């Protein structure tokens, strides 16, 4: 190890008539990146480099609040609203695979140990014309572990939240925000898992329940109004105290599912299965400027 | 009590806050931290690793065939073999590399690039090439007498099948940026051209067509600034599994 | 110098005369699980010379059209000798691996094999939302081939596979590649029958070519488990 806060300086260089020495000749077959220095390939000047390296720290690179969940539901009277619809609440299994920016940024490593900072942002809208105003409603977000039973209705007795961690917040207030610790039963999360989570040869491939945090049950604590509204809840996740291990090649093809790494490219290049990089005329073609 | 007043920016949710929030689970003890191989603390460690360039962007190259260029024996002298558009913040032979991918998360960059080529022909195959780098300002060199005037290296295939072409940091500014304009002065890096120095001479029992694999890395004087949202990924709809929100 | 190398593990030895070096994954050597990292409280087994030794696989061959081959670890060794016996009788294991790939051709041959050890190579399917099934991942001593080696069969890029512990077999330079793998896992031990820590991929980035008379050119893989510990002894499973 070594502490590097700025980029490295360049040193003055001279003519070389070196016999037996070949700095530019290397061996990619060993698996080592070439150790040719710029002072050994050209004649350099003394440059004192003052460019920092702070913004590429994995703490800076990963600790940014990103949308992980966005769910809209209807705040009305659901007596005759028979469906799988979210009556006045929803359950969400916490994952970081539903939105592709944070997914691709997190999947640059094999293992990650971080604390999650969860921010909930709720907006409301009238269903319809006949606008009369937007209500200041109180919501409840109960954190329920992955292997625990969750509420089945909005007026359930499960929302009494004996020991389940719960937060009550208003729409007119700043967004709700809590910190979830590093919850894994292992020393790091597994962003990737080439195994099956059961013993009976038919578990899901690639997902172990050790790495899912839990469920998030959000309801409207108020009882329904005489008119109906549509309520959108957005969840944001911000990793902190991050540790990253074993970096990986980035995802080039578009994601298909949140359950697996299944791939289908784009119809044509770029980012197609046939071609990731867009095509050019020939290898002697340059999209360059003439005069 | 304390007399206070609220400032502009009060009750706002900036996604780069860096504050302390309320612990949802009190008295929680995380799993003891053990040693795992390959810990990363700076993405500049990652960008310094070699990575294949897709120099064969042609429609006649499919899949893996885009990761190598084929050399042949020519019947003329001083002929051009290939070009490499040095656009890092754009799409090209450098976009799907480690340095390119990680840099496209950022707006500004500085420092020297490292270009390595491995000769993957026969043992009985011989030749000399010249890999040139041209600073920005003009057209890509199409003759060797024009390319030899920039930063170049002549290299002969031998026991070391690899050579390195340093692309030095020759800029006016401390950083280069991205604004989607290729011919911008704050963005254009120059060109990389390969010519035949002598020829590719193979025996009649070796394959007459031989391949180069190009790699690109970054040196330890490389840096990046002003994180972006990576135009290399995106969705127009929700993914397959939506359970349950 | 770096071209001559002898690896001696147990009652097995490998000599190679046209080599490059050997790689230590992330610059780390396999060890035994220390006391400040242990979780299982029963005494481990540690069969040293009976398990720490080279095992050779089925020696695939490559012609024109080859896309590449992969083996999952320890899945590829779960039925070979005393290592595969200790795996069937114990519940937890922990091991590093010494991998040695062999490929010989004449001095009139081309070809560049990329030998990569990928940690936790979760695979994906092509044109399907259904996840890969059990028989798609668990192949055993015979391994599988790549459908789309360009994306490493998971939607990533083969060009960037050089952050993983890798070596090249360029036929004009060397005929062998050796990578030393330590224990890579989030847990100190693991069930060897439902999870693989490593996947060894050999990919022909440059095709095999020559104008001499054609021979069969096989690619052989020798794997030695290193510092094997086994915990949780019970009866054997099939």
């Amino acid at each position, epitope marked *: 190890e070594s502490i590097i806060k700025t980029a490295t300086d360049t040193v003055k260089s001279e003519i070389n008539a070196e016999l037996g020495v070949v700095p530019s000749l290397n061996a990619v077959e060993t698996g080592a990146t070439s150790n040719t220095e710029p002072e050994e390939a050209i004649q350099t000047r003394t440059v004192i480099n003052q460019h920092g390296v702070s913004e590429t720290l994995v703490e800076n690179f990963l600790s940014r609040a990103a949308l992980v969940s966005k769910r809209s539901f209807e705040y009305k009277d659901h007596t005759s609203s028979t469906a799988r619809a979210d009556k006045n609440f929803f359950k969400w299994t916490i994952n970081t695979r539903s939105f592709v920016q944070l997914r691709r940024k997190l999947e640059l490593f094999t293992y990650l140990r971080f604390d999650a900072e969860i921010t909930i942002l709720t907006t409301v809208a009238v269903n319809g014309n006949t606008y009369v105003g937007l209500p200041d409603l109180t919501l409840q977000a109960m954190f329920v572990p992955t292997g625990a039973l969750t509420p089945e209705k909005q007026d359930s007795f499960h929302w009494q939240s004996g020991s389940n961690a719960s937060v009550f917040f208003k729409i007119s207030d700043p967004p709700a925000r809590i910190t979830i610790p590093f919850m894994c039963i292992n020393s790091a999360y597994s962003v990737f898992y080439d195994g099956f989570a059961g013993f009976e040869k038919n578990g899901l491939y690639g997902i172990n329940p050790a790495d899912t945090i839990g469920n998030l049950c959000v309801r409207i604590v108020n009882e329904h109004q005489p008119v109906g509204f549509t309520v959108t809840v957005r969840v944001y996740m911000k990793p902190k105290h991050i540790k990253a291990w074993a970096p990986r090649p980035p995802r080039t093809l578009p994601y298909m599912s949140i359950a697996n790494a299944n791939y289908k490219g784009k*119809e044509r290049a770029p980012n197609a299965l046939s071609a990731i990089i867009g095509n050019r005329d020939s290898v002697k073609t340059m999209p360059h400027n003439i005069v | 009590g304390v007399p206070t007043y609220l400032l502009p920016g009060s009750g706002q949710f900036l996604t780069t806050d860096d504050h302390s929030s309320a612990p949802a689970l009190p008295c929680f003890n995380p799993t003891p931290e053990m040693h795992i191989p390959g810990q990363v603390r700076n993405m500049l460690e990652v960008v310094q690793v070699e990575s294949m360039m897709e120099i064969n962007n042609t429609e006649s190259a499919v899949g893996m065939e885009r990761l190598k260029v084929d050399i042949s024996a020519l019947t003329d002298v001083d002929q051009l073999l290939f070009n490499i558009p040095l656009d890092i913040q754009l799409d090209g032979p450098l976009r799907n590399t480690l340095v390119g991918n990680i840099s496209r998360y950022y707006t500004h960059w500085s420092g020297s690039l490292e270009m390595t080529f491995m000769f993957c022909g026969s043992f009985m195959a011989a030749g000399k090439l010249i890999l040139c780098y041209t600073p920005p300002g003009g057209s890509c060199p199409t003759t060797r007498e024009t390319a030899m005037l920039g930063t170049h290296i002549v290299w002969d295939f031998g026991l070391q099948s690899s050579v390195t072409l340093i692309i030095p940091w020759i800029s006016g500014s401390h950083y280069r940026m991205f604004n989607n304009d290729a011919k911008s002065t704050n963005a254009n890096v120059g060109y990389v051209t390969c010519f035949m120095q002598t020829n590719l001479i193979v025996p009649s029992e070796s394959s007459d*067509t031989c391949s180069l694999i190009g790699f690109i890395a970054a040196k330890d004087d490389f840096s990046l600034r002003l994180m972006r949202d990576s135009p290399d990924i995106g969705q127009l709809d929700h993914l397959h599994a939506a359970e349950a929100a | 110098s770096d071209r001559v190398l002898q690896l001696k593990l147990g009652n097995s030895a490998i000599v190679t005369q046209e080599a490059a070096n050997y790689c230590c994954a992330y610059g780390e050597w396999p060890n035994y699980l220390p006391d400040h990292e242990a979780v299982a409280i029963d005494k481990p087994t540690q069969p040293e010379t009976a398990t720490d030794r080279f095992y050779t696989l089925k020696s695939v061959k490559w012609e024109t059209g080859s896309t590449g081959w992969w083996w999952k670890l320890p899945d590829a060794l779960n039925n070979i000798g005393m290592f595969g016996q200790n795996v069937q009788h114990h519940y937890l294991y922990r091991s590093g691996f010494l991998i040695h790939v062999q490929c010989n051709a004449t001095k009139f041959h081309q070809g560049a094999l990329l030998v990569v050890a990928i940690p936790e190579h979760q695979r994906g399917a092509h044109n399907t939302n259904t996840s890969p099934g059990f028989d798609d991942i668990m192949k055993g001593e015979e391994g599988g081939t790549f459908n789309h080696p360009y994306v490493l069969d998971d939607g990533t890029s083969l060009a960037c596979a050089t952050i993983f512990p890798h070596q090249w077999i360029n036929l004009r330079t060397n005929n062998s590649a050796t990578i030393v793998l330590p224990w890579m896992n989030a847990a100190p031990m693991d069930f060897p029958l439902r999870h693989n820590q490593w996947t060894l991929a050999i990919i022909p980035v440059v095709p095999l070519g020559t104008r001499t008379t054609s021979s069969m050119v096989p690619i052989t893989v020798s794997i030695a488990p290193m510092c094997c510990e086994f915990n949780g002894l019970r009866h054997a499973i099939t």
Partner: antibody
Framework: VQLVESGGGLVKPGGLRLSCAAS????????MTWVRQAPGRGLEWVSS????????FYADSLKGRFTISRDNAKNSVYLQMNSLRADDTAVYYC????????????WGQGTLVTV | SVLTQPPSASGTPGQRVTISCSGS????????VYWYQKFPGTAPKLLIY???QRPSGVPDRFSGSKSGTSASLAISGLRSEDEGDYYC???????????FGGGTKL
């Protein structure tokens, strides 16, 4: 630059190989295709094979009865039509692609395969 | 994923005929259109490539063009040798193959 095919004439459900041969160019840098004429029907592309022989393309009409091959050492390209039918009676030309898909500038002379 | 050509292009006294090609976003919208002529005993002969370009050996006739879709081949002279069977070819990304249209000119 120069292409010569070889094959034709056999019973209904049989099989055969066409074995075109190229001489005027490298042949390890181009994509070689097959195209049938099928008298009474118009031109229809049959198959393609890339330089590395890892990617093959196989017009969907014919399901799996054909298997395009390649030999960069002998500068030849083959079809190996399997489970022939009377519908497969055609003149089969081999072409050389010129750096773009479907861009064929040099063609073989054609071999009539009669089923 | 189909190219569509008119079966017949009559009008051979010395006029300028137009042969058309109908495609979709799979083949013509984003890929180059190639025009081949074909005679009952000769290998196909490329006339237009990359929607407008002529090979070396083709006369200044056979213009060829494309407007988003609906590629068009224009011949000027309708001579005795011009009698043939013209095909519109292009690569298809859905089918992952080449498709021809088929149309004989009288």
């Amino acid at each position: 630059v120069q292409l010569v095919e070889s094959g034709g004439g056999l019973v209904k459900p049989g099989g055969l190989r066409l074995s075109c041969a190229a001489s005027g160019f490298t042949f390890s840098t181009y994509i070689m295709t097959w195209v049938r004429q099928a008298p009474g029907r118009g031109l229809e592309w049959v198959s393609s094979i890339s330089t590395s022989s890892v990617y093959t393309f196989y017009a969907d009409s014919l399901k799996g009865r054909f298997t395009i091959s390649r030999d960069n050492a002998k500068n030849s390209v083959y079809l190996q039509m399997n489970s022939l039918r009377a519908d497969d009676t055609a003149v089969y030309y081999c072409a050389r692609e010129e750096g773009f898909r479907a861009y064929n500038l040099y063609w073989g002379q054609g071999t009539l395969v009669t089923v | 994923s189909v190219l569509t050509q008119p079966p017949s292009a009559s009008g051979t006294p010395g006029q300028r005929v137009t042969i058309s090609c109908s495609g979709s976003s799979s083949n013509i919208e984003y890929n180059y259109v190639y025009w081949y002529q074909k005679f009952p005993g000769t290998a196909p002969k490329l006339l237009i490539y990359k929607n407008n370009q002529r090979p070396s050996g083709v006369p200044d006739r056979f213009s060829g063009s494309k407007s988003g879709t609906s590629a068009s081949l224009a011949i000027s002279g309708l001579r005795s040798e011009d009698e043939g069977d013209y095909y519109c070819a292009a690569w298809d990304d859905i089918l992952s193959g080449v498709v021809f249209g088929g149309g004989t000119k009288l």
